[PDB]
Amino acid sequence: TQMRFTEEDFNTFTIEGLDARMEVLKETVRPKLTALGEHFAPTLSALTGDEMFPHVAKHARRSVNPPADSWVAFANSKRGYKKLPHFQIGLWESHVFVWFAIIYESPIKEEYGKLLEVNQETITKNIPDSFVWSADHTKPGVHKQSEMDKEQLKTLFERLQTVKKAELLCGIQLQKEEVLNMNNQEFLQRIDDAFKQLAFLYRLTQKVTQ
After folding, report:
1. Helix, strand, or coil here: 102?
2. How far apart are CA 63 and CA 115, in angstroms?
3. Which SUPFAM superfamilies is this protein grouped with?
């Protein structure tokens, strides 16, 4: 099946109202998120060495506010993903994102933070300058690695262990124009390649999570 997002998928996030937007989202975006979940779960399991399970994002059951983005997450749990380091594939009306994430809900984000600060040279070395970072998955903004200061990436790890609502996300962005002009396989390959680059970040946390 086709998993690459088309124009009607990005445009779904412009529909006004929770009810109206949700009716379209369950028709355009969600089916593709679920397909992406079944497709990439085996891959991440093979890549990380841990059993990975897909989790399509919920909206109406969690918030009364219309979602500006949706995604499918992958974690080493069959019931959830928010409390563990995970991966994500999603989109806003402007772009598609692929993340390795540690969000506020993670009860042990303080340890991950101290561990990332100790491997800062290795992380900088293995994460391409074309990648991006984020301290909050609910805001579309990101920080480009190419224009990331050494102190900036360090403070980002520090705030992860200092500020309770600070997060850590690393991945890539595929602009709407790019996604609309590439084919399915090229789309799957961009995501697949990003997971290969992001895999070592999961392994670092793998150790601290016992």
Report:
1. strand
2. 33
3. YktB/PF0168-like (SSF142913)
Structural tokens at position 165: 């609502």
Domain residue limits at 123: 1-210
Distance between CA atoms of residues 103 and 164, nearest Å: 10
Report the CATH number at residue 55. Answer: 3.30.930.20
Distances (CA, A) of 123 to 147, 203, 208: 15, 12, 16
In whole angstroms, give the CA distance from residue 202 to residue 74: 11
SS3 category, 172: strand
Report residue 22 as tokens. Answer: 């949700």
Q: What are the residues facing 91 on neighbouring strands?
A: 70, 96
Residue closest to 174 by CA, chosen among 94, 70, 110: 94
Q: How many domains does the chain have?
A: 1
At what angle are helices 150-162 and 109-118 packed, to 10 degrees? 160
Q: What is the resolution of this structure in A?
A: 2.5
What 46-55 contacts at long range (C-beta under 8 Å, 24+ apart), as own/partner pairs, is 47/195, 47/196, 47/199, 48/199, 48/202, 48/203, 48/206, 49/203, 49/206, 50/76, 50/202, 50/206, 51/76, 52/76, 52/87, 53/77, 53/78, 55/80, 55/81
Specify the experimental method.
Answer: X-ray
Is residue 100 within 8 Å of 87, Cβ to Cβ?
yes
State the amino acid at position 40 in one-letter form: F
Tell me how far apart the alpha carbons of residues 187 and 25 are, in angstroms, rounded to a whole number: 20
Distance, CA of 126 to CA of 9 (rounded, Å)? 32
